[PDB]
Amino acid sequence: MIVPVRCFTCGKVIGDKYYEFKRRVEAGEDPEKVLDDLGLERYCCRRMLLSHVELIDDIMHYRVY
Amino acid sequence: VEAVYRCFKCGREVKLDLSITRDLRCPYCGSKILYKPRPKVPRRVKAI
Amino acid sequence: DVTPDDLWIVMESYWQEKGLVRQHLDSYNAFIERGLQEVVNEFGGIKPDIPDFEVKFGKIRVGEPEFQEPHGQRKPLYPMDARIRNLTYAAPLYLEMIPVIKGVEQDPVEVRIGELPIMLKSKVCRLYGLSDEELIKLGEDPKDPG
Ligand SMILES: [Zn+2]
Ligand SMILES: [Zn+2]
Predict the structure, then answer these.
(1) Nearest to C90, CA basis, from C108, C61, C115, C113
(2) Rounded Cα distance, B37 and C42, in Å
(3) CB of C62 within 8 A of CB of C94?
(4) DSSP A4-64
(5) How many H-runs (helices) and E-runs (strands) does chain C carry?
(6) Quick check: A62 contacting B, CB < 8 Å?
(7) A13 within 8 A of A38, measured Cβ to Cβ
(8) Closest-CA residue of chain B to C137
(9) Alpha carbon of B7: minimum distance to chain C alpha carbons (Å)
(10) Of residues B40, A47, A56, the one with CA closest to residue A35
(11) C66 and C113 in contact (C-beta within 8 Å)?
């Protein structure tokens, strides 16, 4: 549910760039420019950041012990 | 033998024995559901 | 003129205001509101094998979802507990009986005639009108339509 550590296709580490991308996009910057700045040229990597969902917060509230 | 259990709702610690207890109850909040906690022993998981 | 991208804004409000399962909730709410009283008024009353005593029916009232514990008293019930303890999410059904002695009516009496299962998120369920925080605290998915 949390952001994947590595890109599925080419194995590049993109786990640490998700929050940066989200915060920058929310500020109104061009998503393409932000992705290029972060250093993701192959669209295989860009897909992981663009299509991700953060469901960990939604499923965190129910505990099982 | 006496065993350890956790409440479903309040998540507190509740101790009782099923073979004797005629009425399961959480004394702190009255919940009728209890969990069996994870034992404190190491387990090995393969990262593959 | 208007544009399809504008009509989309209007159309979205339809699903925004009214859920996707309204055809169940509306019918069940109408049932609770009127159908019980109508089906009771259809029968009218009960006339046993008695010389000069009979009972005519009155109003119907349905209470909150509750459960009579075997070792305790009636307690409030929630859907999570009901579906974990293999219970049945139902509420008590109350009926008023009017006794008639020799053609005159006596004081009404209210009795329990049974339990009626409650459709979730209906106008009588405990989840009605709750915010997402409360539903989270009750162990429910806030996106559940009921
Ligand atoms: Zn990649
Ligand atoms: Zn408890």
Answers:
(1) C115
(2) 56
(3) yes
(4) PSB-TTT--B-GGGHHHHHHHHHTT--HHHHHHHHT--SHHHHHHHHS----HHHHTT---
(5) 5, 7
(6) no
(7) no
(8) B9
(9) 13
(10) A47
(11) no
Q: Which ligand is nearest to the CA of B29?
A: 2
φ, ψ of residue C16 in degrees (nearest 5): -65, -50
CA dist A47 and C62 (Å) reads: 54
- Method used to obtain the model: cryo-EM
Q: How far apart are CA C123 and CA A17, in angstroms?
A: 46
Distance B15 CA to ligand 2 centre (A): 11
Tokens of C100: 């008639």
Interface test with B, best of C67, C68, C69 (most B CBs within 10 A): C69
**Is A63 within 8 Å of B38 when comparing Cβ atoms?**
no
Compute the distance between CA of residue C42 and CA of residue C55 in angstroms, rounded to an integer.
Answer: 14
Dihedral angle of Cα B8, B13, B18, B22, to the nearest 10 degrees? -80
- What is the CA angle C13-C17-C22, rounded to 5? 120
Place of tokens 């405990």: C126
